[PDB]
Amino acid sequence: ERPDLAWLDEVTMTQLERNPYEVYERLRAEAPLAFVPVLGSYVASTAEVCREVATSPDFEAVITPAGGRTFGHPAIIGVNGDIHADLRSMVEPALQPAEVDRWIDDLVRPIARRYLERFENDGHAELVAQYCEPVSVRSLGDLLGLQEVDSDKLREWFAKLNRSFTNAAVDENGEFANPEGFAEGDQAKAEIRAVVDPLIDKWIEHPDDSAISHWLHDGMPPGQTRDREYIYPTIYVYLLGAMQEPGHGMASTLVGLFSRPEQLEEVVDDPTLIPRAIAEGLRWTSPIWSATARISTKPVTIAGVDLPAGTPVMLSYGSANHDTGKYEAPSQYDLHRPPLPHLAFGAGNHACAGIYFANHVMRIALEELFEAIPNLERDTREGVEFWGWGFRGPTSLHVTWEV
Ligand code: HEM
Ligand SMILES: COc1ccccc1O
């Protein structure tokens, strides 16, 4: 209904999945808060608007429509008040920095070595499938208590959940355009239940050091546990983004480094630059690109738009992280950018709970990769395609090295 934005009626879901940055460049200039018809929602595209909405007292969390169809209730990302406080209290212990520092090295480093050992003498690899994804999922899976679930299965689950969660397209009547696209998310959930229900049965009676056992038991009266239906949606939140994103982020960081060969060389020579390299990678291609949202709780005016109460706004943090109000030439990867604030972990009460853990997973993985293969090069015969609007990352990363 905004006349000057009639061009947005012609934006497609496929276009946004393939490459959302041209449309979002226009949005940041034309309408930092804009209703995108194919998404069925207002979208926040700039750093100022995303930060304002994420931190405003007049907004609260809401799950996106496709996210809710995928995860149900109470997903930690979609709830507020006492339920959110309890779910944050449940997930935070293992994520506390002092706690992560106690065990993160002995968790991730042997995992990274195990996956490297499989290919480090080959002279070629596709790092998304052979390294970045397995290390990310094996690390978190072991932390959670899912040691027995193979990395290939954790990877399949996150991919199916991604596609269902981001199945956001709506038709001319505001109805989901592709209802069949939720079926694979439902199938993943059914598989997850079949594996995890017996584990929860065991943990209720026999608590252990796994994170999910602690989710059941922590803070509960004697002999009581949180109901499994109450915790499953947050398990699904983990089995999508927490499993997927460290792998996404380390792979994007590698693509960015390969794009600046002098910078790759600096980081291989001086691995203390790895954290900076990662932070720039997350800004450059944000793993959680436009997955979350907030909803107004009263009438508000944001970026000149008067919103009624009850209005959802999607937080396109991956666009915010290319805001030219903040960054020069944001589509260029540059290790030597000054260490400015970014929105790849969101903001406010619903900001990422796992930042410290995620940063260490990616750091340790990259350290081990460069120690193992110091002469790592991108295989320039192959293209790198990035995919995703809700969650974004490279679909492959072919590399080569002299053996
Ligand atoms: C590089 C990897 C990661 C990125 C880029 C990422 C980014 C994000 C973003 C953007 C959000 C939404 C914040 C908002 O709406 O303002 C989020 C939420 C979340 N993150 Fe992460 N994160 C990643 C890894 C993880 C990991 C590994 C875990 C768990 C161990 C995790 C746990 C969560 C939780 C629990 C939430 C929901 C917080 C809430 O709604 O209260 N994160 N993260
Ligand atoms: C940490 O996992 C998520 C974050 C935001 C949206 C969906 C997720 O699975």
Numbering used by the authors: 5 to 407
Q: What's the paper's own text on this?
A:
As reported in a companion study, we isolated a cytochrome P450-reductase gene pair, gcoAB, from Amycolatopsis sp. ATCC 39116 (encoding proteins with accession numbers WP_020419855.1 and WP_020419854.1). Unlike other known tetrahydrofolate- or non-heme iron-dependent demethylases, which are fairly substrate specific, the P450-reductase pair characterized here (GcoAB) demethylates diverse aromatic substrates, potentially providing an important advantage in both natural and biotechnological contexts. GcoA and GcoB operate as a multi-domain complex; guaiacol is processed exclusively in GcoA, with electrons supplied by the GcoB redox machinery. While the organization of P450 systems is diverse, the architecture of this 2-protein system, combining a catalytic P450 with a 2Fe-2S ferredoxin domain in addition to FAD and NAD binding sites, represents a new class.
The X-ray crystal structures of GcoA (in complex with guaiacol) and GcoB were determined to resolutions of 1.4 Å and 1.7 Å, respectively. The GcoA structure reveals a typical P450 single-domain architecture with a central heme adjacent to a buried active site, captured with the substrate access loop in the closed position. GcoA possesses a broadly hydrophobic pocket with the two oxygen atoms of the substrate coordinated by backbone carbonyl and amide nitrogen groups from residues Val241 and Gly245, respectively. A series of hydrophobic amino acids is responsible for positioning the aromatic ring, including a triad of phenylalanine residues lining the active site cavity. Close examination of the GcoA-guaiacol active site shows that substrate binding involves interactions between the peptide backbone and the substrate hydroxyl (ring C1) and methoxy groups (C2). The ring C3 position has a relatively close (3.8 Å) interaction with the porphyrin-γ-meso carbon that bridges the propionate-substituted pyrrole rings. Demethylation of guaiacol, which binds tightly to GcoA (KD = 6 nM) was then monitored over time via NADH disappearance at 340 nm under steady-state conditions. In contrast, the free energy profile associated with the opening-closing motion of either GcoA:guaiacol or GcoA:catechol exhibits only one minimum, associated with the closed state, suggesting that the enzyme will close when the substrate or product is bound. The same simulations also suggest that the active site constrains the binding mode of guaiacol, so that the methoxy group points toward and the hydroxyl group is oriented away from the heme iron. This may forestall the lower-energy cyclization reaction pathway predicted for guaiacol by DFT calculations.
